[PDB]
């Protein structure tokens, strides 16, 4: 049976402590996945943890220059929630160096992008067999979430953006279902730019937060139906979602430029005009997690705020942030859970090592008493080498 | 089918050797956690070991400073029973320094407390979803049972602290449904003091015995209905129970003050008036381990008692103990069968490592022959580092 | 239920990424069986990868003269497709130097033959027990696919070789029900030399290409009824093949003699009269790895042919190559799925190390979009030894 | 569905190899358990080695002494047929220093021997679950089969010794019904040693072949009914199949005393009158390994037989030897099945190392062709350490 998605998300009022893999802290002696662009998705049954490794482990030579973000021995890989990545507890996904997946209630849809920068294939796998494919349309990195993709009714939903990362760049949405492309709409959004869009439902309708690495230190958002029919727009919140950003102050609901471009993958839950926003501490590195609530702040452009949930000190490195879903077929509840993950960076290029890795966390929202606190990665570098 | 819990205890006259993991023995090469607090829980079809990991394995330097009690990295992960804990072969459960576990005969509900040692809160997990959460109310280490909570007819009982270490504190029993808060009650225990508890049920009514820290070498006890209706005590024995303790002497049915301070987690199995008392060897350090039966201890003060069984050599380091149980739908007999585990705990304090670990033995209450042995953790420090 | 092998070929565009394992990379560190001739296959329900162990480990003494063919201590065992093949992750399947395997829709049915190279036996396994043996009937190196057998309807089919390797030698077509010979007929081809099968169902009808290892740069095939009823040829286009081969010429419907000793292990799909063949790109040495679909190259002569994909570089090394299929009962197709894989030899004689192993990419046959590239080994030369 | 155990042997001509672990080899460079006394068992679904660990992995420190044969950390565990037995692959049955292991159909029958010398207790466990225990009645090293037990109709099989091993012991017979004790008889063998009893089931009658300790250099046999009425003799062939021995000559009925001290774990299947024998090729050392079949050998003194089959060369080392049976509830065959393993012994006492361990191999009989070979363990002695 298909996961409906037809369910509003559960009202909340902070974030309770889901996961920590202690990866890095593991792979100093066991046998650990050199990996970034980790994602948490979640069945009907059960809750895994996607990944992009390096084809590599780490404390090992072929952990060299692995602050690098393509190559061809870059796979997706999956393992279940909360364990340290390694050749002995997950499966094997996809050859990628960009990826997707979520689960329909029946199958798992895989996406894994590979190829050379000029030409890259997005191949799509519907319980792990080839379903479809999708071709570089502005031979200029294709790239997608790094994150879950949302279903609905039998029915999942991505983004993948096309052409350069430093100005105009090309984005689409895409429908499939059982792992085929059945539609797809490209976004009239001039001066927008989105990427690595982190995508949830809520009652039927997808709401995607995305990455401006172009001149925004807002982030931008698309929110769409099952017909791809979409509105475009960017939060308006003072306090500014990316990194790099600007100290919080007047906000906008077009991009802010200061300190706009490069940015940093993440997320925000849509809770009628108000949002909650897991931004990095830190305005500058990749550094510290907080989860903020700004009851007017999907709309409104002041700074004010009425809850701060720490989640990771400044004095530690975090990065990549993303949302995911539990479905009321999977928990029981009668509403959509929302939940995230924050992948938390060690190595190049802010520290001295000759490799690149991520370690991960995640929690879910609650409607009862949480507590903030610093969950960091904790591995002692450098490594032995 | 929810396990019943309605059925009396099993008649026994020993134990028998059930599981030994040889942990710490295998960690010198092999990829094993450093671990401490470990615990035995079944369900209706299996039986899995449950601890608290430092997020760090054994013979690397992340398992520096592992005699500390609680940090960010601490996960509770489990495994099937008798096998050595591993990232290769461990189930993730919760992020916690302290834990409780136990299988209702429809899913496991994990008990995991993470945070700040002035707000801690404990994540309450069905079936590996949260269901919810629980908020230290006196801000002093919120602490629960570090074993198996107690299940019967569909709702689950544990006892967690609140408050200092060394005087009183605040002590309260959970009922839960389905990873849920029903009901809970503050015990009414002046100069009492209840700490780890390890609770068993007994034809629909939950014992534990648990560690006076505070001015107790005898062990507190608390029993209680479906409905959260008590009654407290110490055991009588002069065979003490508790490390530290004096020499075996005249008893007290309240906290018995020499050598009270302080304490380990132990347990005891109540027939009738008897009891089965498991106690370290030494009166004062870890050491040793062996099986008593007192068969008037539960409510008489006198010293003497009818039968040892030894488990551990005093020459050998012990640790934590608990009780585990088996019930009816697990093993098709007409009772609820008493087995115990021991942690085997190596390194700091009183050894010169860098690290603290525990391996585990365990043992069920049979009615047929036994033997006293020694079952040490066997391996040689100190370890390459 | 039986696979059905009914129906036809899928039509194909090009060739989309499946799986990469990274074997040699990740066993530089993880403890990564030394291997080699991987080939996969699928069930119904899952596709697995089969592989020669040498019965040791990269990166340990024990991998000390790999590069030798033929041991006692040779297994074939399988793990998950794109997965690093372990001792924590895979099956063992049988004492083996020489290996096929094939699912049926019900069991495995796996092929191992080990024993002296002049009374060597294959074992036949249905569901891992032992069903049938095939003595050596030329006492000169009984040998086999390196590649899945094929099955329709509920019976499978495999070639065996026996003679020797600069010469006629004899050629046998085997059919098996349960893992049972039930028929075998011995081909009557006088001047050609058939070795190392990649056999595949289409309609209901086998079709093999092979390895002419004595006097033949083109490769020869076999088709055959579910009765061995058969017909042999070479393909006749002049894109050459096996490894050593001529420059691309003039083709022959006989063998190759230029640089016709000697070989590799490979593959084609026949298309009507086209062709798709999988070939090195270095006419000398096993490097680079494309494919080539020639639309008129099964009967014709020529050199043209339509389209190029890159698959491995000229500069990488490549090595066995094989077909393998997915059927309309796992996929829900309409039709048979082509899909290929290629084994990357790394090591002995090639390279100054005292082992030799390979990784293995694979690709499956699309209706859509793809791109060429290189998926090379990556692994960096010598190891630590 | 219980295994009836009600069909004959299968008639067979030879022995097909099933498995080989490569342990030791693998257990160089990955962590791979030191073990002794291997044994195969299977149930109606699946194949498994069992062993006796050392707590330990290879080329560890923990390694070192472990040619003594009983201690604390000893353990019963097991792992799929063919694999390297690991933390990471293998299953915990028991706490065991002598071991026995069998499926009815239902479910894993084990039994682990543990405790001290003076009074050690078998440990019986149905399903994992302890469900009878047997005390030591000689005070004298209790110990059981180190090879599969054997099931007939819901009923197993066991035979237990205690007592001298230089002298006349204490032989007991045990039939258990879901892994409790409902008849025992003592055998009435004056003269004879049972010990290491290979057993196994022939419609619907026990066979055991055995070691004799004190005074025999043919081995001892025991059959019975379901109802423990019992035969006794010693195979009467002069091709004698005990460790140590003297040269093949004039056979007896009863213990052949020149070279009868000392043995090695072995068996025998009898054909009518006629017997396969399993022995070590060395008529000194654990050495080498073969199987002859000799037409009269059960009931016959003479040392001429029809046919021998090299498992082992003489130049390599062997160990320890016993039968194992496949049923036609696994098989789908109208008959039981014979197989048999063979332990390699690495290490002291006759290779200069700190430790001892074992490999293994196995190989099914068979009614088609087959071959003699050696498939030694292949381990490079000595280890890093
Ligand atoms: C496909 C790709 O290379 N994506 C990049 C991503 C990208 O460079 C920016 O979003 C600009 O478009 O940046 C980062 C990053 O850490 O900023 C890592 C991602 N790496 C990987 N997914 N491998
Ligand atoms: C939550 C916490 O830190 N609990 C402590 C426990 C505690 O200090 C005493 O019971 C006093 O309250 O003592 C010990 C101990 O070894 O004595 C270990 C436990 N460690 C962990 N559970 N991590
Ligand atoms: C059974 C056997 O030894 N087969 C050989 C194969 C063979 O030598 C040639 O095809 C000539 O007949 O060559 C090769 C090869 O790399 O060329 C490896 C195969 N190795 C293994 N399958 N182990
Ligand atoms: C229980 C026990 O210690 N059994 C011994 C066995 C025994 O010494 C002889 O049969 C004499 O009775 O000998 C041997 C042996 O290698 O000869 C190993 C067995 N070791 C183990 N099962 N651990
Ligand atoms: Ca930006
Ligand atoms: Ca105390
Ligand atoms: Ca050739
Ligand atoms: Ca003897």
């Given at each position: 049976?298909?996961?409906?998605?037809?369910?509003?998300?559960?009202?909340?009022?902070?974030?309770?402590?889901?996961?920590?893999?202690?990866?890095?802290?593991?792979?100093?002696?066991?046998?650990?996945?050199?990996?970034?662009?980790?994602?948490?998705?979640?069945?009907?049954?059960?809750?895994?943890?996607?990944?992009?490794?390096?084809?590599?482990?780490?404390?090992?030579?072929?952990?060299?220059?692995?602050?690098?973000?393509?190559?061809?021995?870059?796979?997706?890989?999956?393992?279940?929630?909360?364990?340290?990545?390694?050749?002995?507890?997950?499966?094997?996904?996809?050859?990628?160096?960009?990826?997707?997946?979520?689960?329909?209630?029946?199958?798992?849809?895989?996406?894994?992008?590979?190829?050379?920068?000029?030409?890259?294939?997005?191949?799509?796998?519907?319980?792990?067999?080839?379903?479809?494919?999708?071709?570089?349309?502005?031979?200029?990195?294709?790239?997608?979430?790094?994150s879950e993709c949302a279903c609905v009714n039998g029915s999942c939903f991505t983004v993948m953006t096309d052409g350069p990362s430093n100005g105009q760049a090309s984005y689409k949405i895409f429908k499939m279902?059982?792992?085929?492309?059945?539609?797809?709409?490209?976004?009239?959004?001039?001066?927008?730019?989105?990427?690595?869009?982190?995508?949830?439902?809520?009652?039927?309708?997808?709401?995607?937060?995305?990455?401006?690495?172009?001149?925004?230190?807002?982030?931008?958002?698309?929110?769409?139906?099952?017909?791809?029919?979409?509105?475009?727009?960017?939060?308006?919140?003072?306090?500014?979602?990316?990194?790099?950003?600007?100290?919080?102050?007047?906000?906008?609901?077009?991009?802010?430029?200061?300190?706009?471009?490069?940015?940093?993958?993440?997320?925000?839950?849509?809770?009628?005009?108000?949002?909650?926003?897991?931004?990095?501490?830190?305005?500058?590195?990749?550094?510290?997690?907080?989860?903020?609530?700004?009851?007017?702040?999907?709309?409104?452009?002041?700074?004010?705020?009425?809850?701060?949930?720490?989640?990771?000190?400044?004095?530690?490195?975090?990065?990549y942030s993303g949302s995911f879903v539990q479905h009321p077929e999977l928990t029981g509840l009668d509403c959509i859970r929302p939940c995230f993950w924050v992948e938390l960076i060690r190595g190049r290029p802010?520290?001295?090592?000759?490799?690149?890795?991520?370690?991960?966390?995640?929690?879910?929202?609650?409607?009862?008493?949480?507590?903030?606190?610093?969950?960091?990665?904790?591995?002692?570098?450098?490594?032995?080498?």
């Open positions: 049976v298909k996961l409906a998605g037809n369910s509003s998300l559960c009202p909340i009022n902070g974030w309770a402590v889901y996961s920590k893999d202690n990866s890095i802290r593991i792979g100093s002696k066991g046998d650990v996945f050199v990996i970034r662009e980790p994602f948490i998705s979640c069945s009907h049954l059960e809750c895994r943890t996607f990944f992009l490794t390096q084809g590599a482990l780490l404390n090992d030579k072929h952990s060299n220059g692995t602050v690098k973000d393509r190559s061809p021995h870059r796979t997706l890989m999956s393992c279940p929630v909360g364990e340290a990545p390694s050749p002995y507890n997950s499966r094997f996904e996809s050859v990628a160096w960009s990826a997707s997946a979520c689960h329909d209630g029946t199958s798992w849809l895989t996406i894994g992008i590979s190829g050379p920068d000029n030409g890259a294939v997005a191949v799509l796998k519907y319980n792990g067999i080839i379903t479809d494919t999708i071709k570089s349309w502005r031979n200029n990195i294709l790239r997608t979430q790094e279902e059982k792992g085929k492309v059945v539609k797809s709409v490209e976004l009239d959004a001039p001066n927008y730019y989105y990427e690595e869009c982190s995508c949830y439902p809520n009652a039927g309708e997808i709401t995607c937060v995305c990455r401006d690495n172009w001149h925004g230190s807002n982030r931008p958002w698309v929110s769409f139906n099952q017909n791809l029919e979409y509105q475009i727009g960017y939060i308006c919140s003072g306090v500014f979602g990316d990194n790099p950003r600007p100290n919080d102050g007047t906000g906008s609901c077009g991009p802010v430029s200061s300190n706009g471009a490069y940015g940093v993958k993440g997320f925000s839950f849509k809770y009628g005009n108000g949002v909650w926003i897991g931004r990095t501490k830190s305005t500058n590195s990749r550094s510290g997690f907080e989860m903020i609530w700004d009851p007017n702040g999907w709309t409104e452009t002041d700074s004010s705020f009425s809850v701060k949930q720490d989640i990771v000190a400044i004095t530690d490195w975090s990065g802010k520290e001295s090592t000759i490799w690149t890795s991520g370690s991960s966390i995640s929690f879910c929202g609650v409607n009862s008493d949480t507590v903030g606190w610093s969950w960091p990665d904790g591995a002692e570098l450098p490594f032995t080498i």
